[PDB]
Amino acid sequence: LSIYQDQEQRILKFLEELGEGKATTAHDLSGKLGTPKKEINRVLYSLAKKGKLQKEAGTPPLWKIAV
Amino acid sequence: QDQEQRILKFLEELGEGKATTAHDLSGKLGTPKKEINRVLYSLAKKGKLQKEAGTPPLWKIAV
DNA sequence: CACGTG
DNA sequence: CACGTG
DSSP states (O other): OOHHHHHHHHHHHHHHTTOSSOOBOHHHHHHHHTOOHHHHHHHHHHHHHTTSEEEEOSSSOEEEEOO | OHHHHHHHHHHHTSOTTOOBOHHHHHHHHTSOHHHHHHHHHHHHHTTSEEEEESSSEEEEEOO
16 A cells, blocks of 8 residues: 555556556556656556556557456 | 757867767766757757767767 | 656 | 657
């Protein structure tokens, strides 16, 4: 229940309530949560390393829950 | 654009054929590498500097 | 314009 | 690992 974990949870929750295969950008996420895109991306890539999220390469990249 | 100037001088004040890096310029100038580069790429497009190498890039006055 | 970078 | 980016 740390502040960083709360942030990770906020992002994971946002993406989970997105839908089946729907993805979103770091830009959108940053805007909805009121957090700078840099911090968001730092968390998104980190969570992808942990396997919880999948990055769909592109410009910009799209993010969603893994598998 | 005083910032641009300061960087511009420092660079012309460099040895004949010696090229430097944004990282080095940051330490040698006590300025964030973000602004350094912002200037470096601008001066390069403006033809006042030249960039070579790749990872990272090396900067020296243009001839 | 992708950029997350410690 | 480059990264300059508003």
